């Protein structure tokens, strides 16, 4: 009784790229590709109280009103210590921000997920320097 | 929008997966999987097509010893020669000898990855890691 189904929810842009990759790489279903991705990513981590330096890279829609304020509210309410943020415009729609910060594993993970979840944020990717 | 779809897999495999959800800050299995999917699709995209494209954007994060003679200049020379275009560099001191810099880069996937490899190989560079982005994520 070893095969189960579990649901996955994808934003449409990601789902469209997944479908294109299934076609380009000769997979026969979304289920097959995702399954293989999971198998692969495993081969390729405990959170702790130790202070670490980290960088969060965020790409966001700079026309989204109040988005910067929300990010600031999250940064200030997080237990992390943000050293600095730097932001540049990529194009007429998007900006890229790098946030350099220090905190423990729990605090930094939470910040990444809170920012990543905001409407208008295209992604929030973390680099940890432990 | 958001479109949900079903994935089938062996319970054994699923147990390891469902195992890092609560650990990775997630509330549902999707989000570890969503991020694995994102990561893998970006890698695939960077692996293909354009030796002529120069539209990729990335961030290289470096920790290095700025007391070391010529290291700062060496990293600059490497950058100048890579063909990549540096959009912005931010630097902070972590201690007396070590700085962290974030370098926002534009260029082709080849040039950017090589820049990372070359910088990472220098004496006095303690850490060099690239954050990759693909246009399907933001366009």
From Swiss-Prot, chain B:
Names of the cofactor(s): Ni(2+)
Q: Which UniProt keywords apply?
A: DNA-binding, Metal-binding, Nickel, Transcription, Transcription regulation
Q: Does the keyword ATP-binding apply?
A: no
Q: Tell me the cofactor note.
A: Binds 1 nickel ion per subunit.
Q: Name one GO molecular function term.
A: nickel cation binding
Q: How does it assemble?
A: Homotetramer.
**Protein name (Swiss-Prot/TrEMBL):** Putative nickel-responsive regulator
């Amino acid at each position: 009784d070893s095969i189960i189904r579990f649901s996955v929810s994808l934003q449409q842009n990601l789902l469209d790229e997944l479908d294109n990759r299934i076609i380009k790489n000769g997979y026969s279903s979304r289920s097959e590709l995702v399954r293989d991705m999971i198998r692969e990513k495993l081969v390729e981590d405990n959170p702790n109280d130790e202070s670490k330096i980290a960088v969060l890279v965020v790409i966001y829609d700079h026309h989204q009103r109040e988005l910067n304020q929300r990010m600031i509210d999250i940064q200030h309410a997080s237990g992390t210590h943000v050293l600095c943020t730097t932001a540049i415009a990529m194009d007429e729609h998007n900006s890229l921000e790098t946030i350099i910060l220090q905190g423990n594993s729990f605090e930094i993970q939470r910040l990444q997920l809170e920012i990543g979840g905001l409407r208008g944020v295209k992604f929030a990717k973390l680099t940890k320097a432990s």
